[PDB]
Amino acid sequence: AVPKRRKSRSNTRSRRSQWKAAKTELVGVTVAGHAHKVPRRLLKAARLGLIDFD
Amino acid sequence: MNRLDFVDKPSLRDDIPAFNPGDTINVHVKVIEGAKERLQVFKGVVIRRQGGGIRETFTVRKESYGVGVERTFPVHSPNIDHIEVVTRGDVRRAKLYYLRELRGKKAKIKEK
Amino acid sequence: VIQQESRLKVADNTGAKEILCIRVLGGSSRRYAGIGDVIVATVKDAIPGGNVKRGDVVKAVVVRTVKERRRPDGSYIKFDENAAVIIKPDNDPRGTRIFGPVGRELREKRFMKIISLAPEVL
Amino acid sequence: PKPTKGPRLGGSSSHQKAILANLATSLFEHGRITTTEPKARALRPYAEKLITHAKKGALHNRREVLKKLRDKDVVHTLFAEIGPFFADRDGGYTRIIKIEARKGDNAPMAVIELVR
Amino acid sequence: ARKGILGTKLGMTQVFDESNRVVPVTVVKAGPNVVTRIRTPERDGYSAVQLAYGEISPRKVNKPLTGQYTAAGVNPRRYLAELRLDDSDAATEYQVGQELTAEIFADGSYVDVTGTSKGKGFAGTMKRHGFRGQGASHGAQAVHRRPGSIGGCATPARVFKGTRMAGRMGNDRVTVLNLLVHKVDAENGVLLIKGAVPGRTGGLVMVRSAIKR
RNA sequence: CAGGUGGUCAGGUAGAGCAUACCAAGGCGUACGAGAUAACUAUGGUUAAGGAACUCGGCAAAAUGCCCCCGUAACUUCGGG
RNA sequence: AAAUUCCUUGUCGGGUAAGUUCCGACCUGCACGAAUGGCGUAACGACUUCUCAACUGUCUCAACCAUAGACUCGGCGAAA
RNA sequence: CUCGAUGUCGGCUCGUCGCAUCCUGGGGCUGGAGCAGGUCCCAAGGGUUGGGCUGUUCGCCCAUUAAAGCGGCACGCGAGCUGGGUUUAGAACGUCGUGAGACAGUUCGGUCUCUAUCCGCCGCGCGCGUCAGAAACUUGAGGAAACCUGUCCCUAGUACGAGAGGACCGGGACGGACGAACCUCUGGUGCACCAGUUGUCCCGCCAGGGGCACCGCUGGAUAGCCACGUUCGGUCAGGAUAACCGCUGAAAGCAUCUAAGCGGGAAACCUUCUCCAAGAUCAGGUUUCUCACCCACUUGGUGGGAUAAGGCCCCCCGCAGAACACGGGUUCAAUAGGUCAGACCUGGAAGCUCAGUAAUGGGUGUAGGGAACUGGUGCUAACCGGCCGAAAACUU
Ligand SMILES: [Mg+2]
Ligand SMILES: [Mg+2]
Ligand SMILES: [Mg+2]
Ligand SMILES: [Mg+2]
Ligand SMILES: [Mg+2]
Ligand SMILES: [Mg+2]
Ligand SMILES: [Mg+2]
Ligand SMILES: [Mg+2]
Ligand SMILES: [Mg+2]
Ligand SMILES: [Mg+2]
Ligand SMILES: [Mg+2]
Ligand SMILES: [Mg+2]
Ligand SMILES: [Mg+2]
Ligand SMILES: [Mg+2]
Ligand SMILES: [Mg+2]
Ligand SMILES: [Mg+2]
Ligand SMILES: [Mg+2]
Ligand SMILES: [Mg+2]
Ligand SMILES: [Mg+2]
Ligand SMILES: [Mg+2]
Ligand SMILES: [Mg+2]
Ligand SMILES: [Mg+2]
Ligand SMILES: [Mg+2]
Ligand SMILES: [Mg+2]
Ligand SMILES: [Mg+2]
Ligand SMILES: [Mg+2]
Ligand SMILES: [Mg+2]
Ligand SMILES: [Mg+2]
Ligand SMILES: [Mg+2]
Ligand SMILES: [Mg+2]
Ligand SMILES: [Mg+2]
Ligand SMILES: [Mg+2]
Ligand SMILES: [Mg+2]
Ligand SMILES: [Mg+2]
Ligand SMILES: [Mg+2]
Ligand SMILES: [Mg+2]
Ligand SMILES: [Mg+2]
Ligand SMILES: [Mg+2]
Ligand SMILES: [Mg+2]
Ligand SMILES: [Mg+2]
Ligand SMILES: [Mg+2]
Ligand SMILES: [Mg+2]
Ligand SMILES: [Mg+2]
Ligand SMILES: [Mg+2]
Ligand SMILES: [Mg+2]
Ligand SMILES: [Mg+2]
Ligand SMILES: [Mg+2]
Ligand SMILES: [Mg+2]
Ligand SMILES: [Mg+2]
Ligand SMILES: [Mg+2]
Ligand SMILES: [Mg+2]
Ligand SMILES: [Mg+2]
Ligand SMILES: [Mg+2]
Ligand SMILES: [Mg+2]
Ligand SMILES: [Mg+2]
Ligand SMILES: [Mg+2]
Ligand SMILES: [Mg+2]
Ligand SMILES: [Mg+2]
Ligand SMILES: [Mg+2]
Ligand SMILES: [Mg+2]
Ligand SMILES: [Mg+2]
Ligand SMILES: [Mg+2]
Ligand SMILES: [Mg+2]
Ligand SMILES: [Mg+2]
């Protein structure tokens, strides 16, 4: 099927606004006297030094 | 063990012999013909066990008048009076479904 | 189990050797025919010079079924060929005796003359 | 072990036996493997059932490991080093540690390593 | 007037009755319950009775729900449901804190057993509603399990409400009526109930005495 | 760009074979991925009892299948079939 | 009664439990016919048509399993 | 009305509606003895089969059934399927035309396109509202689904009838079709299960195994999912009624179901049974829990900050599942994996040893290998943590 008519501004901005990024949360890590922020799912590898903080 | 072994424990029957697929077995079945209570004998060849305790079944097989007939009883069924072991058997499988397509003298299971 | 277009061996001496199911009597749109069920049939093979001919429309009760049949005692029963006996309209066989064993479910369907002529009734 | 509920690793199920055979060879050889995370949840019941054959140490258990590992230089270190090291540990021989997901496909990654 | 109890589906097994027939049963641990609340018509508008069931650690129960058992003098349970009674001689036989066990049913009685059925996921039309499907050969281009038509034509230019389509099946509240209680087992807190019983093995099941009989 | 393009060389084990299966010499993993038991569609597999009752129609699928030895009909233009 | 027959599912015999199709005939050939050949014919056909044996998910009546998609996440990113 | 396109017959799948009713249900009249009928009245709740022939609708026929209803919806339904018929190009037969050709004559062959924007519909979430913030259990305004029926026995060979034949009303038993739940049994499936085996290559070789050949093929196969399987359902009783049957009774001293008034009365109607449901914006009810700060301004039912009860994200998973949701668990832990022991499937492992010229067979041994189902075990991962989140008053 093809679109019958073009959508209005109020109809194409309502759907497009629901395409967004779900931000993750961050916790505190102390490594070598330095503080950083990783997600909690990577909390073990930060303490094992397996996270390059760049 | 299972979760439901404290329910099936009073319904189990001791004094049932230890047979295997390939044996030849007499099975004494209680039959009610009106109000008579006679006792009919089924002599055949054990081909199957599908275990589980109270739910275990076996399948025997004979050749009545040129027509193969199977009966599938439950073990621990009180319609079986007593099972009596006649002849052992020397088989390699455990379900013996090749006996269904062999007639007559070619269904001879070995002795020991 | 037997439905329309099934071919059955015939377990008596009426001359018919193989019939072909047409209906399964006992209600409307009935699909299957176990042991002890009347069947309208058509005789597709017959011995030359007999009581029945090829092309007759007879009735018949099923006595042997390859599909397993549950009995109320927990047991099961399973024959190796499908067999029927041609009956009269008073539940009596047309022939004089029955070849092969027949099932015990003929005993509650009030077919008492077929059991007494059978060699072995299981 | 528990079979894979779902589509198998690498497409076919013939390929899943090959991927799990080459990851257990590399895990026993090095002691630490960086791989994707669903290929590391699958590895963990498969390598702990090859140390249990190695802890028993019989000939018949060695002939059973050789059904899965086609590398004799790592069957030796499984029966001479990895086997007797875990002799006083009742199961649980590996550890999965989650790493940053990799660029290019956002495939989440984990490391699987032996315990000590 | 209508007795009721809360239990757990433990599985199915078989058993043999007095005339040597086979009876497929379903073990339901109609466990020890406690009353914990009574609905009266001058306070609530109807008449019923709560029933608490199931062992739970007292730290998994939060502070609002812990207080509802404290005004009843009862240690907290896991599940809690009501037994809807009728308003004729309503609730004299229930008191708060009363123990209900599995031997309030007798052998040969009939029960209505209700629970939450098993999830079948997002199911199509030949599984959720028993459609026939089109043919599997003779040219049938890609319609082996599709529904086909769903309406008429330009009159009416709409699909009617209630049309049978695909979607999620299962997870429904299902009551199966008139099941025979084969044997009550007071030592184990076990009913043996003939036949199928809705739910997964381990789920919450309400057992009530039947009215159709 | 799943299409088209003439000629030469062409190993092993099984095999009648340049078929097919598995391999050598030598090449290649060919250029979006990671996941995930939804419906439905494609591509393959299996199915109790019945066996064309399907359908415009046995379409599709299933079946038959190799070597050696016996044996082989109507009809025929004497080759055949 | 045909690759020709409108009336027409002509009528008669055979085949199936039931045969508008099929095979054999009648002749009442709407409107066959002798090199725009008439009537036959062994062989041969990815032809048209009818029946039978064997076989099976075509079907009664569907159920399960794997894969490529569909669905989720990251990248690129069109069209009628 | 549509020619800058509104795609035709039948079948398939899925329906929905009317009653001009085929069956079942209720009645009047009868040239109704009974049994079965004829005709008319009321009634749409459900039910209404499988084949042969034809492209067929129509129609005949076979075998059944309680019956095999007649019609509307673009002669319902091709962005759902089919393409046999019809309406392209090929070819032939008959007839017409000197001919090209033609024939609501016949015959054989003949591409069925489309990634769903909007409304509709089946599902499932996010957001805010419900005058504080939360948690648990609920009433049901209003809707959805379901509604079919047979044979046999007893009452009784009684009522009726010269005979043949043969009941209404009540009571009981066993089925068919349909539906929903379910996996104990039967049966099917089984892509990390066990075993047999062919060809070939590799592991140095023998022995033992493995890769690939549709899972190479073959024999089985627990869990899960299922039907062919198990179990259950359509019930009982009330309320108001249709046709029809009355009671009392005038106008009209009689009579009349009616004008006042009161009853009987069916599968239709409303309750009762199962299910969804307070987004029912009148946004409900019973309870318990938190029941507390701090800062600034223009002192506002104002903005910020920090919390409580509680929840979410993350994590370990599920028989919960497209995402999301829902449910269990997080060291005070048996959630998953391991491990240990049972259950179950397979069918007697390797190694050694004995018998045999060998192929192979016996012993050690209900062996060994193994997944889902049950129970113990604190060994691996459930972590040393983030984000949300509580009240102007006033009138009687
Ligand atoms: Mg066993
Ligand atoms: Mg699986
Ligand atoms: Mg993929
Ligand atoms: Mg393979
Ligand atoms: Mg599921
Ligand atoms: Mg189908
Ligand atoms: Mg296509
Ligand atoms: Mg297809
Ligand atoms: Mg190219
Ligand atoms: Mg060429
Ligand atoms: Mg070669
Ligand atoms: Mg080749
Ligand atoms: Mg390329
Ligand atoms: Mg899939
Ligand atoms: Mg089949
Ligand atoms: Mg078969
Ligand atoms: Mg056949
Ligand atoms: Mg045929
Ligand atoms: Mg069909
Ligand atoms: Mg048909
Ligand atoms: Mg047909
Ligand atoms: Mg073909
Ligand atoms: Mg083929
Ligand atoms: Mg020929
Ligand atoms: Mg012809
Ligand atoms: Mg004719
Ligand atoms: Mg002819
Ligand atoms: Mg002429
Ligand atoms: Mg001439
Ligand atoms: Mg001429
Ligand atoms: Mg010619
Ligand atoms: Mg994307
Ligand atoms: Mg034009
Ligand atoms: Mg236009
Ligand atoms: Mg049409
Ligand atoms: Mg009417
Ligand atoms: Mg009448
Ligand atoms: Mg209707
Ligand atoms: Mg009603
Ligand atoms: Mg209609
Ligand atoms: Mg139409
Ligand atoms: Mg129509
Ligand atoms: Mg359309
Ligand atoms: Mg359209
Ligand atoms: Mg032409
Ligand atoms: Mg001319
Ligand atoms: Mg094509
Ligand atoms: Mg589409
Ligand atoms: Mg209501
Ligand atoms: Mg509303
Ligand atoms: Mg269902
Ligand atoms: Mg089981
Ligand atoms: Mg089974
Ligand atoms: Mg294996
Ligand atoms: Mg060897
Ligand atoms: Mg190779
Ligand atoms: Mg199973
Ligand atoms: Mg009533
Ligand atoms: Mg509710
Ligand atoms: Mg509320
Ligand atoms: Mg949660
Ligand atoms: Mg041995
Ligand atoms: Mg020797
Ligand atoms: Mg084990």
Closest CA in chain C for residue B68: C80
DSSP D53: H
Using CA atoms, how far apart are residues B5 and A47, in angstroms rounded to an integer? 49
Which residue type occupies D86? Answer: F
Which residue type occupies B7? Answer: V
Q: How far is CA E13 from the centre of its chain?
A: 19
Nearest CB neighbour to B4, from listed E10, E16, E20: E10
* Total number of domains in chain E: 1
Task: Note whether E20 contacts B: Cβ–Cβ < 8 A.
Answer: yes
Q: What are the φ/ψ torsions at residue D2 (nearest 5 degrees)?
A: -70, 120
Cα distances (Å, whole numbers) of residue B29 to B20, B37, C66, D86, D91: 19, 10, 22, 58, 52
Contact B72 C68 (CB under 8 A): yes
Q: How far is CA E58 from the centre of its chain?
A: 26
Using CA atoms, how far apart are residues D26 and B23, in angstroms rounded to an integer? 51
Interface test mutation site (partner D, options A36, A38, A50, max chain D beta carbons within 10 A): A50
Using CA atoms, how far apart are residues C6 and C79, in angstroms rounded to an integer? 16
Beta bridge pairs of residue E30: none
Which tokens sit at B33? 């013909």
Q: How many CB atoms lie within 10 A of CB A6?
A: 7
Greatest alpha-carbon pair distance for chain C in Å reads: 45
Q: What are the φ/ψ torsions at residue C60 (nearest 5 degrees)?
A: -165, 140
Half-sphere exposure of C82 (CA within 13 A, CB side): 19
Which tokens sit at E209? 């005495």
State the distance from the centre of ligand 36 to the C-alpha of C29, rounded, in angstroms.
30
Query: Pairing state of beta strands D32-36 and C7-10?
Result: unpaired
Report chain C residues whose CB lies below 8 A from the CB of E16: 74
Using CA atoms, how far apart are residues E91 and E114, in angstroms rounded to an integer? 22
E17 Cβ partners below 8 Å, 6+ apart? E23, E182
Query: Which chains have at least 3 CB atom pairs separated by less than 8 Å from chain E?
Result: B, C
Using CA atoms, how far apart are residues B45 and B21, in angstroms rounded to an integer? 8
Select from E208, E4, E186 the least CA-distant residue to E91.
E4
Using CA atoms, how far apart are residues D61 and D71, in angstroms rounded to an integer? 16
Closest nucleotide C1' to the C-alpha of D51: H338
Query: Pairing state of beta strands C7-10 and C83-87?
Result: parallel
Q: How far is B105 from chain E (nearest CA, A)?
A: 37
Closest CA in chain D for residue A52: D100
Using CA atoms, how far apart are residues D98 and D108, in angstroms rounded to an integer? 8
For tokens 């379900």, name the residue. B95
User: Are the CB atoms for E115 and E30 separated by under 8 Å?
Assistant: no
Cα three-residue angle E101-E104-E107, rounded to 5 degrees: 125
Report chain E residues whose CB lies below 8 A from the CB of B11: 15-16
Q: How many CB atoms lie within 10 A of CB B81?
A: 13
Which structural technique was applied? Answer: cryo-EM
Which tokens sit at B76? 């621990």
Select from D48, D45, D50, D90 the least CA-distant residue to D69.
D50
Using CA atoms, how far apart are residues E210 and E208, in angstroms rounded to an integer? 6
CATH fourth-level superfamily of D1-116? Ribosomal protein L17 (3.90.1030.10)
Report chain C residues whose CB lies below 8 A from the CB of E194: none
Which tokens sit at C28? 């409307």
Closest nucleotide C1' to the C-alpha of C24: H64
Contact B71 C76 (CB under 8 A): yes
E96 Cβ partners below 8 Å, 6+ apart? E35, E36, E37, E38, E72, E73
Domain encompassing residue B105: 1-112
Using CA atoms, how far apart are residues E113 and E8, in angstroms rounded to an integer? 11
Using CA atoms, how far apart are residues B7 and B53, in angstroms rounded to an integer? 11
Report chain A residues whose CB lies below 8 A from the CB of D99: 42, 45, 50-51
Evaluate if the CB of D7 falls below 7 Å from strand H.
no
Closest CA in chain D for residue A43: D98
User: Are the CB atoms for C96 and C117 separated by under 8 Å?
Assistant: yes
Beta bridge pairs of residue B42: B27
Which tokens sit at D90? 């009742």
Which residue type occupies D31? Answer: G
Residue D34's SS3 state is: strand
Task: Note whether A22 contacts D: Cβ–Cβ < 8 A.
Answer: no
Which tokens sit at E151? 């309406």
Q: How far is C29 from chain B (nearest CA, A)?
A: 30
Could you write out the three-class secondary structure of D63-110? Answer: HHHCCCCCCHHHHHHHHHHHHHHCCCCCCCCEEEEEECCCCCCCCCEE
Using CA atoms, how far apart are residues E83 and E175, in angstroms rounded to an integer? 14
Domain ranges of chain A: 1-53
Nucleotides of G under 7 A from a protein CB: 16-18, 57-63, 66-68, 73-74, 80
Q: How far is A26 from chain D (nearest CA, A)?
A: 14
> Which burial class, exposed, middle or buried, applies to E5 when counting CB atoms under 10 A from its CB (0-12, 13-18, 19+)?
buried
Using CA atoms, how far apart are residues C62 and E66, in angstroms rounded to an integer? 67
Element holding D29 (H helix, E strand)? helix D13-30
Domain encompassing residue E131: 1-213
Residue A39's SS3 state is: coil
Cα distances (Å, whole numbers) of residue B102 to B21, B98, C80, D95, E197: 17, 7, 12, 57, 43
* Total number of domains in chain B: 1
Cα distances (Å, whole numbers) of residue B34 to B6, C63, C76, D94: 36, 20, 21, 69
Using CA atoms, how far apart are residues D55 and D46, in angstroms rounded to an integer? 15
Distance D6 CA to H9 C1' (A): 49
Beta bridge pairs of residue E100: E33
Task: Note whether C73 contacts E: Cβ–Cβ < 8 A.
Answer: yes
Contact D97 A44 (CB under 8 A): yes
Asked if the bond preceding D7 is cis, omega within 30° of 0, the reply is no
Task: Note whether E13 contacts B: Cβ–Cβ < 8 A.
Answer: yes
Reported resolution, Å: 2.8
Task: Note whether A41 contacts D: Cβ–Cβ < 8 A.
Answer: yes
Q: Counting every residue, how long is chain E?
A: 213
Could you write out the three-class secondary structure of chain E? Answer: CCCEEEEEEEEEEEEECCCCCEEEEEEECCCCEECCCEECCCCCCCCEEEEEEEECCCCCCCHHHHHHHHCCCCCCEEEEEECCCCCCCCCCCCCCCCEECHHHCCCCCEEEEEEECCCCCEECHHHHCCCCCCCCCCCCCCCCCCCCCCCCCCCCCCCCCCCCCCEECCCCEEEEEEEEEEEEECCCCEEEEECCCCCCCCCEEEEEECCCC
State the distance from the centre of ligand 44 to the C-alpha of E154, rounded, in angstroms.
9
User: Are the CB atoms for C60 and C38 separated by under 8 Å?
Assistant: yes
